[PDB]
Amino acid sequence: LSWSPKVAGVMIACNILAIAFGKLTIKQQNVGTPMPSSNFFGGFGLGAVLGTASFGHILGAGVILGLANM
Amino acid sequence: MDGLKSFLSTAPVMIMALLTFTAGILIEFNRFYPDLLFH
Amino acid sequence: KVSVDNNPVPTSFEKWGKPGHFDRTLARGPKTTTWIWNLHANAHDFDSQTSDLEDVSRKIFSAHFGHLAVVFVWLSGMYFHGAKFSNYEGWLADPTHIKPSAQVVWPIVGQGILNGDVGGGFHGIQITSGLFYLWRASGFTDSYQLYCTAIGGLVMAALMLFAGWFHYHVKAPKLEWFQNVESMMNHHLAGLLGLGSLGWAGHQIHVSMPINKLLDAGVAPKDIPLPHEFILEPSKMAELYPSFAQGLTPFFTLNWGVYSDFLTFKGGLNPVTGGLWLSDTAHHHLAIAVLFIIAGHMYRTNWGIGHSMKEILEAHKGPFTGEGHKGLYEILTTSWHAQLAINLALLGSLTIIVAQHMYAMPPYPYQAIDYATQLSLFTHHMWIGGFLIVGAGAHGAIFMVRDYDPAKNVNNLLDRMLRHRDAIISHLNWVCIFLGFHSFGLYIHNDTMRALGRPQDMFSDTAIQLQPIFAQWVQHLHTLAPGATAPNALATASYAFGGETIAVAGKVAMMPITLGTADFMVHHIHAFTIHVTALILLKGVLYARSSRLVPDKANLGFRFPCDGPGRGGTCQVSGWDHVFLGLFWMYNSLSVVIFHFSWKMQSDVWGTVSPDGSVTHVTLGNFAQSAITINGWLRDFLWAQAANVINSYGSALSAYGIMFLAGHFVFAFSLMFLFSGRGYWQELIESIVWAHNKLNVAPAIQPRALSIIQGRAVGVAHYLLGGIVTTWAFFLARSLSIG
Amino acid sequence: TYGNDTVQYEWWAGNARFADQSGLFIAAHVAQAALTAFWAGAFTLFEISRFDPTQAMGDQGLILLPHLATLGWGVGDGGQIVDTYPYFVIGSIHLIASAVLGAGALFHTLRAPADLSTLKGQGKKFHFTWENPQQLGIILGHHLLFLGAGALLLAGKAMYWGGLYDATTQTVRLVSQPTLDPLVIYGYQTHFASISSLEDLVGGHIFVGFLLIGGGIWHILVPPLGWAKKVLLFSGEAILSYSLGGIALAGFVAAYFCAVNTLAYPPEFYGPPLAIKLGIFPYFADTVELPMHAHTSRAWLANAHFFLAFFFLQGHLWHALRALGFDFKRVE
Ligand code: CLA
Ligand code: CLA
Ligand code: CLA
Ligand SMILES: CC1=C(C/C=C(\C)CCC[C@H](C)CCC[C@H](C)CCCC(C)C)C(=O)c2ccccc2C1=O
Ligand code: SF4
């Protein structure tokens, strides 16, 4: 429940699942504040990558607090 | 303030100032001399 | 994306001396005295003065700042009266015995008898608004904090006034700034509602929880630590809760289970003080803050991600509904009246939700014990909610008359709903008549069966019983909820569904409310009156464009008396007169609702408590077999409980008697405006102008009678004022006599 | 620094505009030195109000007051502070020095011009650029005496103006006549982590200030001949990288010096000497643990000086890559 590689592992796994989700189904992605490159994932941009990382954290708190009591 | 003298002399503000002055002198006369059913 | 024009309107006082300049027909000259009433009837009709959608919107924005100054100076007056002329520290020394009072009366004509002995030697008028329990829930200790809060409120009142002048005469925004409705929606979601909920969650964590914890322990006044001393010394906060020694660090690693000792899910009530748990409400406001700020990022403004609502409304179209919501995004961002109708509908239903939730889950300490506070807060929020719902029915009709352009919304939901107005209203009045017979004729039937001496043929519980099985099953599910369908909850959502009797200071806070056949009949009475008011307002909305009686109703305006005596007679046909009828029907609906509330709570809920467990109520359980009769509603409720308003002279509850009779006077005075028509009074006033012309004192302002809409408006205003003043005086004097 | 003559810099990269102007270059760099002098004086007065004499200095989180208790300013016997006011005079001077350095910060960007080549008097001999090696050697040459001056100011403080606090005898030791041999300085490279010697601390500081004053007279009088120019570069971000990698090394060895030493960082004020741990990152974890979730000042100083010098090493990589012939190169 504290800092561990297990909770960080399921956090990073569901986070990059959320990045793949945002790269698959966001209607308009690129037109925001431009990212310096496309090395991370896709062609997102600053606001778009902040959004899909925040959804990675929302999904992260979801499965982590859904498994910390189960 | 050539318009403030006209706004303070409209009908609601003048009738409210007159009723405030009338209620003021009535309440003051009823404090210093209360309970006068007759003369 | 900010678009501001600079100095649109010059600041000048010369326009204040010329009343009626905003409208074209009023600035010519007061040739007639009806101009005076028109000066108040069009003073806020900003859509009739300007017709460009940009001047009216900034006029609305500055009017919002002015009204916000009015609310801030009202709230400043509440905190100042609680600071200077109250007994808040005296009530905090002894909350159970003495009674709060935040208004002292100047003895001038004998009204010093209104300053009754509220307990502790302090005289004054006992307040029923119950904001003392709000202050104890927030964490106020002495009168100086209330005084500085009143000072800061007056500072923000002058700040809002300066912002109104700045946003109308210095830097006023453009129309595109107002039409940015997605940015407005997500800022109001996150930065206003969610950020304000997070602020109050932080105040409930730091101030409201430790102060109420040590006040529930029994610490006297002038011994509580100051609220900033818990932040300045976290050891005083860590000795009350063990989780505060863990710091911020478990919150960020999602180790929230160690925060369980001070963010609980207890529910129910606090048995020591008779209110909600402050840890429960702190966890509650934090959860609302998280959910609102999450929902505060849904709408795209500048960064690509987000839902623009236009294709949301495009995507919802079915087989029954034609083209769906195609056009509503262009409606609701170009017409302020449609936004006003939706917001008044949902704020009215919100205020009724507030009343229906602040009686079975009392959120404030020692609020459920004070019966006058509970009854007054319930009925006042019920009345504000019903008023705002009638205003929704008004501004829907104003949108139909003056803000509805039929060329833009073809075969959408608005056009399809206006296309079958008969198939809506002719079923709505059918269910009105069906509910009317089956909620009132039940009352007449067992009134007649009781009057004919046959109680076995009534609709009582011993008689033919109409058991409300659905809400009884729902109460069974709420009683069975903690442990089966809410396992981390200790108590129920409330103790009104089912559970133990909460007793605090010899009185009853909340016991389970069983629903017999009397509650069945009065709930169908409530559904009936709700349906009739939702019939008059809905057929004022739909039949505001045109009809088969008069098909030229849109060109005549929203607010016109009649089309004439032809077609049999067309008086009260406008969309305004449906609001005029719906105001009385809201009055009747809410009067029966608050009567059912007051009688059921003082017959089955309230009363004193005894140490062996038995509960004796205020009216000894009259609602079971005597709330099913109209004579039972008259004798056992309106005659028996009005004796505390009647026999209270020469005492503290003496102003309520001369407000009881005052409300009867304004009702009876309203009947003169409602029953009579204008032309009689015009034919009489012209005779008084003759009697003035005989003495050369006839005024050059032409004196003539009120308009027909004005006569109906003053009739419904004095009717609602007189009835609400009568119910206010009765409810306050009764519930202050019973404790 | 590459490409055309003038490149459009946005507001998120706007400090790359005054790099060649040399008039506003002094204005930002003494506004920065005013901010460190502001943090020198205000945050040792911030910690006077949050000071507990009965409680121990380690668990409270006191940072700057152990730094003055190391120099023997107001420490008494047993490891406690007998007077607060000598910590208040030094913080008052650093705040006044923050005012006058902040005063001249707006002088070199409001009244003084954008360069120093328009002047005619003594100020005409102060303009510099990123090309002339003899113009950057006179700037660097006058700096090397001031770094050597702090060693002799340390000597005059230690010999004749106050003692030092240690852990071998745990008292203020007004020492004098240090060691006079340089051979043990070659041997201290392998056990500098535990010096265990007070007379050699001031004895090595005089033995390094004589070297720092040697580099001062050398760098002023002669210019670079050319043996350094053929191996190095002379540009804007070039000379930035020589320093920013060097100060990263200084923060590296100071983050190591905090966690393991006992004499220069006394354990009666900073806390017990830490143990080097590596999980995901190398962090100097505490040996004993606190009752609450707090850490000692030795745990805060050693961890922050390592995390931030690591970013200052990788920021040296950001400037050394751009000072050489390398673009962003987002290919494939
Ligand atoms: C968010 C709230 C809100 C807002 C902004 C508006 C705004 C508006 N309404 Mg409105 N309305 C509302 C709620 C609201 N309403 C509600 C809740 C109802 C149901 C009661 C109505 C019913 C209503 C009607 C029936 C009409 C409007 C009209 C109007 C427009 C012109 C206002 C005007 O001329 O009145 C100016 C202000 C006054 C005339 C003052 C009214 C004074 C009242 C009657 C007495 C108050 C009694 C007081 C509380 C008791 C103490 C007094 C005394 C005993 C001391 C304006 C756009 C009119 C319109 O659009 O016509 C084209 C119109 O005919 N409204
Ligand atoms: C106490 C007086 C009174 C009564 C009884 C009614 C009754 C009614 N009003 Mg109403 N109304 C009133 C005052 C009253 N109003 C006032 C003061 C206003 C002013 C604002 C309005 C404004 C108003 C509007 C605006 C509307 C109504 C409507 C209605 C009808 C709703 C249907 C219903 O309840 O089922 C019928 C219930 C009854 C008739 C009462 C029950 C009485 C018993 C059960 C019937 C008698 C039994 C039997 C026939 C006796 C036989 C004896 C034999 C010799 C004949 C209903 C007839 C609505 C309507 O007609 O459409 C649905 C409508 O839209 N009213
Ligand atoms: C003393 C050392 C030093 C100096 C003089 C400079 C100087 C410069 N750098 Mg730089 N840099 C440094 C260290 C330094 N850097 C380090 C250590 C890193 C690694 C992190 C970087 C990474 C870096 C990048 C990635 C870029 C620069 C750029 C630049 C140039 C433009 C100024 C700028 O960044 O925009 C003005 C300054 C800002 C906008 C400030 C940014 C602050 C952000 C918004 C918040 C970051 C967190 C913040 C520090 C708060 C955290 C507090 C912490 C205690 C937790 C300028 C010549 C830019 C450049 O040359 O353009 C091509 C550029 O893109 N630098
Ligand atoms: C009496 C009556 C009139 C006559 C109405 C009149 C003469 C209005 C009377 C107004 C007088 C001047 C009283 C002033 C109103 C308030 C008391 C003003 C407040 C002033 C204080 C604050 C000082 C109508 O015009 C009418 C029209 C349609 C249906 C019914 C009726 C109706 O019943
Ligand atoms: S009675 Fe009055 S409102 Fe009715 S039709 Fe005749 S004039 Fe119009």
**Whole-angstrom distance, CA of residue C344 vs CA of residue C342:** 6
Which of the residues D330, D331, D332 would you substitute to probe the A interface, choosing the one with the greatest number of A C-beta atoms within 10 Å?
D330
Helix or strand (DSSP H, E) at C310:
helix C309-315
Please list every residue in chain C whose beta carbon sits closer than 8 Å to the beta carbon of residue A65. 254, 256
- Chain C contact for D292, CB < 8 A? yes
Helix %, strand %, coil % of chain B (to 5): 65, 0, 35
User: CA-to-CA distance for C371 and C367, rounded, in angstroms?
Assistant: 8
Across chain D, where does the E strand assignment appear? Answer: 164-165, 172-173, 275-278, 282-285
d(CA A14, CA A6): 12
Find residue D173's DSSP bridge partners.
D164
How close C175 gets to chain A, by Cα (Å)?
24
Give yes or no for a contact between C86 and C140, defined as CB atoms under 8 angstroms apart: no
C247·D291 Cβ contact <8 A = no
Measuring from atom 1 of ligand 5, which residue has the nearest CA? C571
Q: Closest Cα to residue D151, out of D96, D110, D208, D197?
A: D208
Method: cryo-EM
Q: How do strand C608-609 and strand C508-510 relate by DSSP bridges?
A: unpaired
> Which chain C residue has its CA at the smallest distance from A25's CA?
C305
From the CA of C439, how far away is ligand 2's center (Å)? 12
Tell which A residues from 2 to 31 touch D, by Cβ distance under 8 Å: none
A37 interfacial to chain D (CB closer than 8 Å): yes
The span from the CA of D116 to the CA of D137, in Å, is: 17
Short-list C408, C587, C438, CA closest to C520: C438
Residues whose CB is less than 8 angstroms from the CB of residue A13 and which lie 6 or more positions away in sequence, other chains included: none
- Distance (Å, rounded) from C-alpha C653 to C-alpha C733? 6
C247 neighbourhood in chain D, CB within 8 Å: 292-294
Is the Cβ atom of C720 under 6 angstroms away from ligand 2?
no
Contacts of D283 (CB under 8 A, 6+ apart): D277, D303, D306
The DSSP result for D8-63, as a single string, is: ---GGGGGGSSTTTSSHHHHHHHHHHHHHHHHHHHHHHHHHHT--SSS-HHHHT--
Nearest to A69 by CA among C255, C259, C483, C493: C255
Ligand nearest, relative to CA of residue C443: 2
Chains A and C touching, counted as 3 or more CB pairs less than 8 Å apart: yes
D312, D247 Cβ separation under 8 angstroms: yes
Q: Give the distance from CA C439 to its chain's centroid.
A: 26
**Is the distance from CB of C198 to CB of C305 less than 8 angstroms?**
no
Alpha carbon separation from D109 to C121, D128, D215 (Å, rounded): 70, 17, 32
Binding annotation of C: 562, 571, 664, 672, 680-681
Interface test with C, best of A27, A58, A69 (most C CBs within 10 A): A27
Most informative mutation of D18, D26, D318 for ligand 3 (most atoms within 8 A of CB): D318
Q: From the CA of C440, how far away is ligand 2's center (Å)?
A: 10
Q: What are the phi and psi torsion angles at C218 (to 5°)?
A: 115, 30
CA geometry: angle at C718 spanning C714 and C721, to 5°? 140
Rounded (10°) CA dihedral C715, C718, C721, C722: -110
Torsion sign across C-alpha atoms C332, C333, C336, C340: positive
Residue owning tokens 């990152």: D281
- What are the chain A neighbours of C253 within 8 Å (beta carbons)? 2-3, 7
Q: Positive or negative, the Cα torsion across C211, C214, C220, C225?
A: negative
Cα atoms in the 13 Å half-sphere on the side-chain side of D204: 13
C431 Cα to the center of ligand 2, angstroms:
13
At residue C51, φ and ψ (nearest 5 deg) are: -135, 50
Put residue D3 in one of left, alpha, beta given phi > 0 → left and psi -120 to 50 → alpha. left
Distance CA C249, CA C255 (A): 8
Phi-psi region of C650 (alpha: psi -120 to 50; beta: other; left: phi over 0): left
Cα(C341) to centroid(ligand 1), Å:
13
Q: Give the Å distance between the CA of D163 and the centre of ligand 1.
A: 83
Note whether A touches B: 3 CB pairs or more under 8 A.
no
d(CA C674, CA C679) in angstroms, rounded, equals 14
Among all ligands shown, which has an atom nearest to the Cα of C676?
A: 4
Residues β-bridged to residue C2 = none
The Cα–Cα gap between C35 and C710 comes to: 12
What is the CA(C22)–ligand 5 centre distance, in A? 30
The alpha-carbon gap from A36 to the nearest alpha carbon of chain C, in Å, equals 16
Distances (CA, A) of C284 to C265, C360, C368: 9, 17, 20
Resolution (Å units): 3.5
Pair type for strands C608-609 and C615-616: antiparallel
Ligand 3 pocket residue status of D7, Cβ below 6 Å: no
D233: burial class by Cβ within 10 Å (0-12, 13-18, 19+)? Answer: middle
With an 8 Å Cβ cutoff, are A3 and C253 in contact? yes
- Show the domain range for B24: 1-39
Contact status, residue C416 vs residue C322, Cβ threshold 8 Å: yes
d(C-alpha C4, C-alpha C176), whole Å: 9
Helices (H), C84-142: 88-93, 131-138
Residues C373, C354: Cα–Cα separation, whole Å: 14
Q: What are the residues facing C609 on neighbouring strands?
A: C615
Q: Ligand 4: which of C38, C681, C682, C686 to mutate, most ligand atoms within 8 Å of CB? A: C681
Cβ of C676 below 6 Å from ligand 4: yes
CB contact D293 to A (< 8 Å): no
- Written as six digits, the tokens of C257 are 């289970």
Task: Map tokens 């090397």 to a residue.
Answer: D144
CB contact under 8 A, D292 and C249: no
How far the first Cα of chain B sits from its last, in Å, is 48
List, in sequence order, every residue forming a beta bridge with D284; answer none if it has no partner. D276
Number of domains in chain B: 1
> Is C418 in contact with C396 (CB distance < 8 Å)?
no
Q: Which subunits sit against A, judged by 3+ Cβ pairs under 8 A?
A: C, D
Task: Report the residue from C254, C257, C304 with minimal CB separation from A32.
Answer: C304
The position carrying tokens 């050693």 is D302
* CB of residue C706 inside a 6 A radius of ligand 4: yes
The H-or-E segment that residue D65 falls in is helix D64-70
If one residue of C38, C389, C398 were mutated to test the ligand 1 pocket, choosing by the most ligand atoms within 8 A of its CB, it would be C398
CA-closest candidate to residue C738, choices C364, C372, C373:
C372
CA distance C158 to C166: 12
CB contacts of B1 in chain C (<8 Å) are: 13
Q: Mention every residue, 6+ apart, whose C-beta is less than 8 A from residue D192.
A: D257
For residue B22, what is the domain's CATH number? 1.20.5.510
Residues whose CB is less than 8 angstroms from the CB of residue C220 and which lie 6 or more positions away in sequence, other chains included: C93
- Return the exposure string of C196-235: e unless at least 16 CB atoms fall within 10 Å of the residue's CB, then b: ebbebbebbbbbbbbbbbebeeeeeeeebbebeebeeeee
Ligand 4 centroid to Cα of residue C34, in Å, is 11
- CB < 8 Å to A47, chain C: 302-305
Q: Are D205 and D159 in contact (CB under 8 A)?
A: no
Q: For chain C, how many residues are written?
A: 739
A28: closest CA of chain C, how far (Å): 6
Residue D76: helix, strand or coil by DSSP?
coil
Q: Is C700 on the interface with B (CB under 8 A)?
A: no
C305 burial via Cβ count (<10 Å: 0-12, 13-18, 19+): buried
Q: Within 13 Å and on the Cβ side, how many CA atoms surround C228?
A: 1
Which long-range contacts link C596-600 to residues 24+ away (Cβ below 8 Å)?
A: C596/C522, C596/C525, C596/C526, C597/C359, C597/C375, C597/C378, C597/C379, C597/C382, C598/C375, C598/C379, C598/C731, C598/C734, C598/C735, C599/C623, C599/C627, C599/C637, C600/C513, C600/C519, C600/C627
Beta-strand ranges (E) seen in C60-178 are 116-117, 123-124, 171-173
Q: What's at C593, amino acid-wise?
A: V
The set of residues, in sequence order, having a beta carbon less than 8 Å from that of C137 and lying 6+ positions away, is C208, C212, C275, C278, C363, C364, C365
